[PDB]
């Protein structure tokens, strides 16, 4: 009986820990998602067409 009580208590503790971690991760994504997305958008614009290096004539 005490063991199931402690199981419930540990469930509360771990779910609180997961909530805290989720909040921290959400903030960490928020603070710089815009800058990262801008960098990726810059990455998907520069083409530079070129011939295969080994292609011969």
């Amino acid at each position: 009986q005490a063991a199931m009580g402690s199981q419930g208590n540990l469930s509360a503790e771990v779910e609180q820990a997961t909530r805290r971690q989720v909040q921290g991760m959400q903030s960490s994504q928020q603070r710089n998602r815009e800058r990262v997305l801008a960098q990726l958008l810059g990455m998907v614009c520069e083409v530079r067409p070129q011939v295969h290096p080994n292609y011969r004539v």
């Binding site: 063991a3 997961t18 991760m25 710089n32 998907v44 067409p49 292609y55």
Partner: protein
């Protein structure tokens, strides 16, 4: 001792299961955040597509890239029906560049029957003469390629570096 060790073993089993479930939930949440970021990227590039002036420049660049990747006498193009006026001029501009770059001639046609479905944000496709070889130079595939290349930097930015990463090499 039998009853005591059985009870303790069951307790350890339950504790370990709880830890595993917690870690799995955390990782699932991280994956959800990453997928939402990818969705935002898709919406932003959808917005970017509407700017026609830069769209034509990117279209010319991608077309030339495809032509240089294929390098065959017979070629076919495919694109969304509504964007055909841009791609025809793109081909007309790109042909002399290819001729002066490869020192070789090429016949190029545009598919007047098939067109890329509307769900494609933008891009083009190319085929050889026999429609056996193709190249999918679309915005979606390029996005996915760049993402699969650039996951590590994105993770490092959005969640910090690993403390236990004592050495890069």
């Amino acid at each position: 001792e039998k009853k005591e060790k059985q009870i303790e073993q069951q307790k350890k089993i339950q504790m370990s299961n709880l830890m595993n479930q917690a870690r799995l939930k955390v990782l699932r949440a991280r994956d959800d955040l990453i997928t939402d970021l990818l969705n935002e990227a898709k919406q932003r590039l959808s917005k970017v597509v509407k700017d026609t002036t830069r769209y034509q420049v990117l279209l010319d660049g991608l077309v030339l890239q495809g032509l240089y990747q294929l390098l065959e006498p017979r070629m076919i193009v495919r694109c969304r029906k509504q964007d055909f006026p841009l791609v025809k001029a793109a081909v007309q501009k790109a042909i002399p560049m290819y001729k002066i770059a490869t020192k070789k001639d090429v016949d190029v046609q545009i598919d007047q029957e098939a067109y890329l479905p509307e769900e494609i944000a933008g891009g083009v496709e190319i085929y050889n003469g026999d429609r056996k070889i193709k190249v999918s130079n679309t915005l979606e595939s390029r996005l996915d390629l760049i993402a699969q290349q650039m996951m590590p930097e994105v993770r490092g930015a959005l969640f910090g570096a690993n403390a236990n990463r004592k050495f890069l090499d």
